[PDB]
Ligand binder design. Structure first.
Ligand SMILES: CO[C@@H]1O[C@H](CO)[C@@H](O[C@@H]2O[C@@H](C)[C@@H](O)[C@@H](O)[C@@H]2O)[C@H](O[C@@H]2O[C@H](CO)[C@H](O)[C@H](O)[C@H]2O[C@@H]2O[C@@H](C)[C@@H](O)[C@@H](O)[C@@H]2O)[C@H]1NC(C)=O
Ligand SMILES: CO[C@@H]1O[C@H](CO)[C@@H](O[C@@H]2O[C@@H](C)[C@@H](O)[C@@H](O)[C@@H]2O)[C@H](O[C@@H]2O[C@H](CO)[C@H](O)[C@H](O)[C@H]2O[C@@H]2O[C@@H](C)[C@@H](O)[C@@H](O)[C@@H]2O)[C@H]1NC(C)=O
Ligand SMILES: *[C@@H]1O[C@H](CO)[C@@H](O[C@@H]2O[C@H](CO)[C@@H](O)[C@H](O)[C@H]2NC(C)=O)[C@H](O[C@@H]2O[C@@H](C)[C@@H](O)[C@@H](O)[C@@H]2O)[C@H]1NC(C)=O
Ligand SMILES: *[C@@H]1O[C@H](CO)[C@@H](O[C@@H]2O[C@H](CO)[C@@H](O)[C@H](O)[C@H]2NC(C)=O)[C@H](O[C@@H]2O[C@@H](C)[C@@H](O)[C@@H](O)[C@@H]2O)[C@H]1NC(C)=O
Ligand code: CA
Ligand code: CA
Ligand code: MN
Ligand code: MN
Lengths: 243, 243
């Protein structure tokens, strides 16, 4: 088939082999109940300078020459665990080529190589980043932020993420949707007894990514921080693109 | 304050007086556990030709002359109960002037008056409609659909709603978000063991609605159908509009 539909309500079924449903790259590992993105020592304490990725194993169809394009929705809950405030560097949900791998740690979030990070012509990746560190040198806004990245670590759009939520270590729920007809990517982040965060931007995936992509989570540290993905749902539809 | 934040996890607290938290107009009524939008007989059986609205009682700030504009997110679960297939006419989440009231029933969904429904200059309303009836005469697409309505019942954009979901009578969860910086309205509709529906469109609320609006649910019937709203959450933020 050309569309994908999966739901993982939790990850307490930690015994699946690497690469069969989810592929782990770099320092990302499967633990009981979670996809862990960067490295921790014996006590679950975060290591500095680490990067990892957990991605769905199958390729995801996005578009083809015949006009058919996939609209999609993904939701996931995560626990960004902080051991002080501030922490570094964050996490990201991404869509990249099937053949790509984890790249640099720190503020590049395992998605970019330091040398070509601010160069759109040298990257093929769209990511929604949940940034905990202000990298002054790569144009981060002066606060923790949520951002949409298109072929570069310098986000095409961002919205403020409050300190209390960014460094509070509570489980958060994210909803990311893409409408393939109007080329709109929307991010919704919610905290159970807190506030919501909304960020939407026009981006034509067909114009920046290949026809088939790999989807997943990528993180880069940094220090005093580690991200655990607790559940994940992905659904894509070709609705309205003549199919 | 200029922003709104409320959460109703369920409506089993049916004893609040009309107009204090929620205002009921037309045939909409408060019942144990739900906001009922149109009329039913003794047995909960749907009446033909009815319209009703349940709206938040306080005015909601949307924008002002000084550039400040509200981004928002609302979520709600609803049960669109069907007594056969097809049914008519649907429901809608809307934003209208504080002083407006319920209008015609049938395909106008309590939001428009038959005479001026296809005339944008005569209406001030933005609505996300969940349309169960194909009104050939008002340009409905040839299937049940979800649509975004801007000052007219003829939607500026729509996406297919499958027959099985539109007439299946299962509880569905909706997420509607508006980003005031990029002027994007997104609708996400999810069924627990089913599919998701995504529809997003650029619409500048500041350009079509007054500075303060009333928000709520509106329905119009039709026949063999009745909608119950089971929970409702609304959150708005001025984030990124210099405030
Ligand atoms: C003078 O540069 C600073 O040098 C140290 C040692 O090389 C860097 O910090 C170490 O490596 C980081 C990746 C991170 O694991 C950190 O905990 C560790 O001490 C430092 O990098 C910046 O550290 C920040 C946290 O204090 C944060 O993680 C930033 O993302 C990180 O900057 C990124 O990574 C560095 C190595 C460069 O590639 C930068 O272009 C990039 O933004 C160094 N700071 C600077 C400004 O480079
Ligand atoms: C010839 O027109 C048809 O006449 C009947 C009686 O006046 C209309 O049906 C009744 O009223 C409806 C509002 C609804 O309560 C229905 O159950 C009831 O029998 C009929 O209206 C259309 O009925 C459809 C369901 O069979 C559906 O509800 C449509 O939304 C409704 O059309 C709307 O309402 C009518 C009254 C007009 O204002 C239309 O412009 C509008 O789309 C009439 N059909 C038509 C095509 O008008
Ligand atoms: C899970 O399976 C992957 C293969 O599909 C592993 O990645 C591959 O690991 C090789 C080194 O063992 C490396 O040469 C390959 O290029 C790499 N594949 C990609 C796309 O990068 C993966 O290995 C982890 O991630 C790689 C990038 C290295 O950092 C390894 O040290 C890691 O083990 C496997 N993960 C695990 C936990 O087994
Ligand atoms: C809940 O309180 C509302 C007042 O804030 C009622 O609406 C008002 O009802 C008057 C008739 O009793 C009418 O003249 C007013 O114009 C109307 N207000 C608006 C904004 O329309 C509301 O009444 C229901 O809805 C109105 C439109 C009529 O259809 C009434 O018959 C309904 O009772 C009150 N709802 C209930 C259930 O009490
Ligand atoms: Ca950063
Ligand atoms: Ca209709
Ligand atoms: Mn950033
Ligand atoms: Mn319609």
């Amino acid at each position: 088939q050309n569309t994908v539909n999966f739901t993982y309500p939790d990850f307490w079924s930690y015994s699946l082999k690497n690469g069969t449903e989810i592929t782990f790259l770099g320092d990302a590992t499967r633990i009981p109940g979670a996809l862990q993105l960067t490295k921790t020592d014996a006590n679950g304490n975060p290591v500095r300078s680490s990067a990892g990725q957990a991605s769905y194993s199958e390729p995801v169809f996005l578009w083809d020459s015949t006009g058919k394009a996939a609209s999609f929705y993904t939701s996931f809950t995560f626990l960004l665990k902080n051991y002080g405030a501030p922490t570094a560097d964050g996490l990201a949900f991404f869509l990249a080529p099937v053949d790509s791998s984890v790249k640099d740690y720190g503020g590049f979030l395992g998605l970019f190589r330091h040398e070509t990070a601010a160069d759109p012509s040298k990257n093929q990746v769209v990511a929604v980043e949940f940034d905990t560190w202000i990298n002054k040198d790569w144009n981060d806004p002066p606060y923790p932020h949520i951002g949409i990245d298109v072929n570069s670590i310098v986000s095409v759009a961002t919205t403020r993420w409050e300190n209390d939520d960014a460094y509070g270590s509570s489980i958060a729920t994210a909803h990311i949707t893409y409408d393939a007809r109007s080329k709109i990517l929307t991010v919704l982040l919610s905290y159970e007894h807190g506030r919501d965060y909304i960020l939407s931007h026009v981006v034509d995936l067909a114009k920046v990514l290949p026809q088939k992509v790999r989807i997943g989570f990528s993180a880069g540290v940094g220090y005093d921080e580690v991200t655990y993905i607790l559940s994940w749902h992905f659904f894509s539809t070709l609705d309205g693109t003549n199919k």
